[PDB]
A paper describes a structure:
Each asymmetric unit contains a dimer of [name], with a buried interface area of about 1100 Å2 on each subunit.
Superposition of subunit A of the apo-[name] structure against the ferredoxin-like fold domain of these structures revealed that the overall structures could be superimposed, except for the extension of β5 at the C-terminus of [name]. One of the laterals is mainly composed of hydrogen bonds between Arg9-Nη1 and Glu74′-Oε2, Arg9-Nη2 and Glu74′-Oε1, Asp43-Oδ1 and Glu77′-Oα, Tyr50-Oη and His76′-Nδ1, Glu74-Oε2 and Arg9′-Nη1, Glu74-Oε1 and Arg9′-Nη2, His76-Nδ1 and Tyr50′-Oη, Glu77-Oα and Asp43′-Oδ1, whereas the other one consists of backbone hydrogen bonds (Ala40-Oα and Ala82′-Nα, Ala42-Oα and Leu80′-Nα, Ala42-Nα and Leu80′-Oα) from strands β2 and β5′, and vice versa (residues from the symmetric subunit were labeled with a prime).
Residue numbers in the entry:
A (entry chain A), B (entry chain B): 2 to 82
Write the structure that this text describes.
């Protein structure tokens, strides 16, 4: 399944910090059969969007939690255009 | 510049409805040099995420308005991983 998750409150985040966070997810994602495909961040509002594939939102969130940053919101996105 | 925008209240949206909404944006995006890259929808939560390239959030929103669906939230996402 496909998921979009959102992290809020991240104002001022740098490219280095976003890379670091994404690498932390990648380091433990395979245990849960999750793959984080893309991350996009707005340092002004402090909003990070993460697109993943995995068996469930629960699995995606367990990966994030191990990586140090559980998402504030997660939605399955079964439709795409 | 790169933008992520969010539409809420789209409970129960179908694949056909998402496809047509995306087609409507694509039909008028050129005028504003806006380029919608991908859309993802969650019919359960009623959330649509739209990733685009355009000159500004103002331009992206003018396109959405013409296509009949101004986004509830729009963020420049200058960082990606």
């Amino acid at each position: 399944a496909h998921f979009m998750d959102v992290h809020r409150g991240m104002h001022g985040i740098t490219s280095d910090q976003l890379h670091q966070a994404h690498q932390a997810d990648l380091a433990v994602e395979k245990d849960e059969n999750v793959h984080f495909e893309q991350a996009w961040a707005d340092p002004a509002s402090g909003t990070i969007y993460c697109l993943s594939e995995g068996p469930s939102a629960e699995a995606v969130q367990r990966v994030h939690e191990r990586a140090g940053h559980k998402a504030d919101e997660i939605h399955e996105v079964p439709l795409s255009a």
